[PDB]
Amino acid sequence: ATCYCRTGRCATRESLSGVCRISGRLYRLCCR
């Protein structure tokens, strides 16, 4: 799977797969 740590929501073709953590804040991990 190929993934992005996103600032907003996942793209429609991506699925939320986890969270990314940056400086103690959570972001969506979105994968395809």
Swiss-Prot record:
The disulfides recorded in the entry are: 3-31, 5-20, 10-30
Q: Cite the effect that the entry attributes to residue 7 to R.
A: Enhanced antibacterial activity against both E.coli and S.aureus. Enhanced membrane binding and membrane disintegration abilities, as well as further increased antibacterial activity
**Impact of mutating residue 9 to K?**
Impairs antimicrobial activity against S. aureus. Reduced induction of IL-8 secretion
Q: What is the effect of changing residue 29 to A?
A: Reduced interaction with B.antracis lef/lethal factor and decreased bactericidal activity against E.coli and S.aureus. Reduced enhancement of S.flexneri infection
Result, substituting residue 31 to S: Prohibits tetramer formation
User: Can you say what this protein is called?
Assistant: HD5(63-94)
What is the species listed in this Swiss-Prot or TrEMBL entry? Homo sapiens
Full-sequence portion shown in this chain: 63 to 94 of 94
